[PDB]
Structure formats: structure tokens, C-alpha cells
């Protein structure tokens, strides 16, 4: 989910 | 009155509230911003960025790139759908997991758009000390995300  | 019709429902107004302000966040370090380049807040610490993440983190995994934009995007869909099933079947009056679910369903749409409509995510918080360590860009999404995880970590304690 995050960006990385 | 009205408000037990939809029955724990109208919280999604606080994960749309998160998407909103993800989104108009990118939209302004996109347009003043060169990539790489930097705003100095604080001389050491604090300064705004522009970086594309393409998921280089993760790219020990495969023989080539620009399969995490696709992989990323359907796990967010799966868990997105279960989180606003899990918040229906929320009782009334558990207030702290029903802002807590609604905050990671949030920030999980806004990366969510990015890797679908671009082809990354826009990082614009660059934390950081002198030139000895540098931490990953992120953004308000990754905010709410770590925020609402929290939340569910010290839940029942
Ligand atoms: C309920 C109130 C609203 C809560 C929501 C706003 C709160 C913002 C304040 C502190 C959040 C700190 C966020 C720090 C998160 C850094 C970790 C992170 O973003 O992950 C990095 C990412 O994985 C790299 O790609
Ligand atoms: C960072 C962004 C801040 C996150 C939202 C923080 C607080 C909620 C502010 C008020 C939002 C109104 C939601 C209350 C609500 O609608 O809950 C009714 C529910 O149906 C009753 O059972
Ligand atoms: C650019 C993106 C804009 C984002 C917005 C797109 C338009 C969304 C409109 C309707 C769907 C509503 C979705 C959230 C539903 C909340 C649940 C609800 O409707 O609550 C019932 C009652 O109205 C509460 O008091
Ligand atoms: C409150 C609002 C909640 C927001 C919910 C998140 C938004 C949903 C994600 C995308 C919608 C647009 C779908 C666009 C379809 C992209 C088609 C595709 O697969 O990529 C094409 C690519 O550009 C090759 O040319």
C-alpha cells in the first residue's frame, strides 16, 4: 500500500 | 433519524478526506519542483523534495523493472475491499477502529491512483541529518497509512  | 439507515457508513467521509488532500499535496511539488530537487526548511533536517518511487526497493525480486507498478496496485484493491467490509460489520460505538479503519483505506487509494494513472508514486518529504543519513521520501498517504496501522496495533491494549 505504501509508496515504496 | 437518518443516520441509522447507513449504519457506520458515512466514515468513508473521513477516508475521502484523505484522498483529497493526498492528491492535491502531489499536484503542487509536481509544478514547482525539478526532479531531485531540493527546498531547504531546516538546513539539516527538514526540506521538500520530487521523487518518482518505481519500487527499486523490492527489485531484488525479478530480472527486470515495472512489474511492481501492476503487483502494488492489485494488492491495495484487495485490501481495500476487505477493509470497508470489515468497517460495515462495525458495531456502533467502537469509534476508535472505525476512524482508524477509514485513515488506511485512505491513504491506500491515493498511491492507488498514482501507480494506475502515472507510472509511480510522487514523494515530496524529504526527512533527513547532515549528509549521514538520508530517509526515504513519502507522502500523506504513507502518513495516514502508518497512522491508522498504529492504531490497530495498540488496539486491544
Ligand atoms: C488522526 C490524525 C491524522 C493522522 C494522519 C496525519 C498525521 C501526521 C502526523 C504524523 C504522522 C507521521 C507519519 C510518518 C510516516 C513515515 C513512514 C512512512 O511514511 O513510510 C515510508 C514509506 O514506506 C517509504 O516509501
Ligand atoms: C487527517 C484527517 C482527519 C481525520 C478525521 C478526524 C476526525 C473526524 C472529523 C469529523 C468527521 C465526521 C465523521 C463522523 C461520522 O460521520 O460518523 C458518524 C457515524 O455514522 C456514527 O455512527
Ligand atoms: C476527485 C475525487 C472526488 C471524490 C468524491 C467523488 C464523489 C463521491 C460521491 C458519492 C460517493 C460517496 C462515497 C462515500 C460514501 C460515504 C457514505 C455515505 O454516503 O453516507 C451516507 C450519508 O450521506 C452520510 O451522512
Ligand atoms: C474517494 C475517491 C476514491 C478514489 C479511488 C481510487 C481511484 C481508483 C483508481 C483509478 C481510477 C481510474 C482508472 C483508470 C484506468 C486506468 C487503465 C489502466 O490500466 O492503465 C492504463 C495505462 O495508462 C496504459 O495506457
Request: aromatic share 16%.
Amino acid at each position: 500500500l505504501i509508496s515504496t | 433519524p437518518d443516520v441509522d439507515r447507513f449504519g457506520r457508513l458515512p466514515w468513508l467521509w473521513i477516508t475521502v478526506l484523505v484522498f483529497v488532500l493526498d492528491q492535491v499535496s502531489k499536484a503542487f511539488f509536481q509544478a514547482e519542483l525539478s526532479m531531485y530537487q531540493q527546498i531547504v526548511v531546516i538546513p539539516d533536517l527538514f526540506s521538500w523534495t520530487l521523487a518518482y518511487n518505481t519500487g527499486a526497493a523490492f527489485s531484488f525480486l525479478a530480472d527486470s523493472s515495472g512489474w511492481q507498478r501492476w503487483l502494488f496496485a492489485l494488492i491495495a484493491i484487495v485490501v481495500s475491499a476487505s477493509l470497508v467490509v470489515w468497517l460495515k460489520r462495525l458495531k456502533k460505538g467502537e469509534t476508535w477502529l472505525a476512524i482508524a479503519l477509514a485513515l488506511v483505506l485512505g491513504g491506500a487509494l491515493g498511491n492507488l491512483y498514482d501507480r494506475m494513472v502515472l507510472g509511480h508514486v510522487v514523494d515530496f518529504i524529504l526527512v533527513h541529518w547532515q549528509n549521514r543519513w538520508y530517509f526515504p521520501a513519502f507522502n500523506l498517504a504513507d502518513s495516514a497509512i502508518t497512522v491508522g496501522a498504529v492504531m490497530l496495533a495498540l488496539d486491544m491494549f
